[PDB]
Amino acid sequence: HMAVKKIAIFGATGQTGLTTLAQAVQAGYEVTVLVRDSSRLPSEGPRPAHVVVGDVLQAADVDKTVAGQDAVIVLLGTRNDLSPTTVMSEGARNIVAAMKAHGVDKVVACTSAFLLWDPTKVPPRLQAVTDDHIRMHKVLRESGLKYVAVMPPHIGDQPLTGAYTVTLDGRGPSRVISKHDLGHFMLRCLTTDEYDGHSTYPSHQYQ
Amino acid sequence: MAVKKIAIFGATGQTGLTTLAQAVQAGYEVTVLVRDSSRLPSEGPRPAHVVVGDVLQAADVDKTVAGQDAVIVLLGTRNDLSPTTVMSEGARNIVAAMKAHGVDKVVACTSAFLLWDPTKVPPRLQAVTDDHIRMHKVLRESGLKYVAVMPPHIGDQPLTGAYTVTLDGRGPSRVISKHDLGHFMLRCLTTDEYDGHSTYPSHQYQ
Numbered sequence: 379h380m381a382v383k384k385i386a387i388f389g390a391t392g393q394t395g396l397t398t399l400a401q402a403v404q405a406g407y408e409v410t411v412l413v414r415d416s417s418r419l420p421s422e423g424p425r426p427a428h429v430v431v432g433d434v435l436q437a438a439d440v441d442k443t444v445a446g447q448d449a450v451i452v453l454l455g456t457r458n459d460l461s462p463t464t465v466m467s468e469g470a471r472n473i474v475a476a477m478k479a480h481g482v483d484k485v486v487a488c489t490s491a492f493l494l495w496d497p498t499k500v501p502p503r504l505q506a507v508t509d510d511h512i513r514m515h516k517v518l519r520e521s522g523l524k525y526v527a528v529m530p531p532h533i534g535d536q537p538l539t540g541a542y543t544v545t546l547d548g549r550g551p552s553r554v555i556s557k558h559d560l561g562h563f564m565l566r567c568l569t570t571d572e573y574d575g576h577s578t579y580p581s582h583q584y585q
Numbered sequence: 586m587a588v589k590k591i592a593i594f595g596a597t598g599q600t601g602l603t604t605l606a607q608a609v610q611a612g613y614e615v616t617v618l619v620r621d622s623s624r625l626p627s628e629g630p631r632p633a634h635v636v637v638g639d640v641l642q643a644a645d646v647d648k649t650v651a652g653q654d655a656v657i658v659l660l661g662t663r664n665d666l667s668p669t670t671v672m673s674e675g676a677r678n679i680v681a682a683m684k685a686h687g688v689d690k691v692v693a694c695t696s697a698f699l700l701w702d703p704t705k706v707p708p709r710l711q712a713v714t715d716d717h718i719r720m721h722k723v724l725r726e727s728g729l730k731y732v733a734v735m736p737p738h739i740g741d742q743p744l745t746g747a748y749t750v751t752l753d754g755r756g757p758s759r760v761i762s763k764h765d766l767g768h769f770m771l772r773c774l775t776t777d778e779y780d781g782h783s784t785y786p787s788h789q790y791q
């Protein structure tokens with residue numbers, strides 16, 4: 379009885395992706411992942427239904443990942459690397475093109491709460507990555523797709539609670555979200571239209 | 586002195602479309618060079634003259650520059666991620682045509698990466714940035730009255746007319762709305778104060 383049942387996850391091998399993947403498999407989703415050839419999912423962990431090996435910078439690989447899905451979750455990032463980059467914005471351009479070509483409308487994509495900050499207050503060391511989040515958000519906003527812009531504060535290692543605050547179109551009352559709660563929220567956004575076209579800032583106080 | 590007739594190159598682009606609309610609304614007699622006229626909007630403000638052709642074809646550029654008072658350049662090559670010379674070769678054709686027709690004023694957009702350390706440029710944007718640098722040198726060496734416009738990220742916020750312009754360096758904000766950027770390109774036609782300078786338009790929106 380799953381209206382959304384087939385999903386693509388971009389970034390499933392990452393910090394938030396791994397727990398999003400685990401929670402999605404447990405919840406009954408049929409998950410397709412795009413993984414880079416050198417970086418597959420861990421063998422002991424939950425297995426998705428379909429694996430595409432390739433790169434988000436290749437339209438052909440993104441097309442193969444998006445075809446036949448109900449919705450797309452985007453958890454791309456650069457791990458610890460703070461260098462100038464366009465992997466997230468160019469990846470988003472490819473995702474948008476594939477979604478349009480394949481009739482997929484719902485995209486839930488993670489950038490960061492700095493897109494809700496006074497821009498001159500972003501820490502300089504994070505500005506190069508933030509610049510690409512800004513480029514990525516513009517690509518997704520201008521696409522016309524049903525886009526949920528997830529803009530989290532610091533991502534931590536605290537528990538899954540399902541009890542976090544979701545602040546619409548502004549910064550929320552806490553400065554952290556656990557990676558498990560962030561993935562839980564990305565999946566929650568598949569089951570409702572209420573956040574489409576909005577920015578969302580999930581946050582919580584772990585106690 | 587008084588500018589009434591302008592050519593716009595890159596009028597079908599993101600900044601070009603709004604610069605064109607604003608220029609027509611303000612009263613300029615606008616000539617555009619477009620590769621495909623269906624990419625111009627069917628409704629609303631329409632340019633006075635449409636040349637169908639390619640900035641890489643000197644004859645097309647000459648036909649676009651003839652009779653103008655000033656030229657606005659909003660060329661770009663969004664998809665190119667490896668060495669590309671479209672913008673700089675286009676600028677060479679524009680310079681030759683302006684010299685041949687006695688047009689003295691050019692306001693051309695490159696990017697604020699030309700005001701930052703080269704290591705700030707994302708790898709996949711290096712080729713476009715290299716050609717922006719080539720285009721900037723072509724225009725600086727031309728002897729024409731040249732305003733170098735070097736914007737940071739181009740956003741979609743509504744026109745304000747209230748942005749800051751920093752001369753020969755960078756200002757505090759790192760966004761300019763495409764509408765404000767177009768407004769600034771047109772402001773550069775009304776004054777000589779920016780000639781021979783680099784200009785960085787930016788603003789705080791919220």
Ligand SMILES: NC(=O)c1ccc[n+]([C@@H]2O[C@H](COP(=O)([O-])OP(=O)(O)OC[C@H]3O[C@@H](n4cnc5c(N)ncnc54)[C@H](OP(=O)(O)O)[C@@H]3O)[C@@H](O)[C@H]2O)c1
Binds near residue numbers: 412414432488530
């Ligand atoms: N850390 C924070 O406190 C914080 C706060 C707010 C926002 N954010 C942002 O939240 C987002 C998610 O962060 P995260 O820590 O969960 O992610 P992450 O650990 O950095 O994981 C990045 C994911 O993207 C994949 N990826 C990168 N390049 C790719 C490419 N060319 N093709 C295909 N996949 C590619 C990575 O695959 P590989 O396994 O192959 O590397 C990995 O799965 C990021 O954009 C981050 O900037 C982070």
Ligand SMILES: NC(=O)c1ccc[n+]([C@@H]2O[C@H](COP(=O)([O-])OP(=O)(O)OC[C@H]3O[C@@H](n4cnc5c(N)ncnc54)[C@H](OP(=O)(O)O)[C@@H]3O)[C@@H](O)[C@H]2O)c1
Binds near residue numbers: 594597697737
């Ligand atoms: N945030 C940003 O995006 C950003 C920031 C700083 C600087 N810049 C730079 O600012 C400039 C303007 O950017 P933009 O986004 O407004 O431009 P754009 O949307 O990419 O449009 C580029 C324009 O150049 C035209 N063009 C390309 N090749 C041509 C050719 N051979 N002959 C004739 N016309 C040609 C295009 O015509 P068609 O419609 O026929 O394709 C289009 O009208 C660019 O140089 C860009 O690199 C961009």
Ligand SMILES: Cc1nc(-c2ccc(OCC(C)C)c(C#N)c2)sc1C(=O)O
Binds near residue numbers: 459533554
């Ligand atoms: C408290 C607080 N931390 C934030 C934060 C922290 C680290 C980040 O990136 C780290 C890097 C390794 C990607 C990013 C991003 N992008 C955003 S935002 C925020 C707020 O208050 O809004």
Ligand SMILES: Cc1nc(-c2ccc(OCC(C)C)c(C#N)c2)sc1C(=O)O
Binds near residue numbers: 698710714717
């Ligand atoms: C914040 C910031 N963004 C810049 C930027 C962004 C996109 C660009 O190209 C778009 C691509 C699709 C061709 C170019 C160029 N050229 C430059 S520069 C800059 C700064 O602050 O220096």
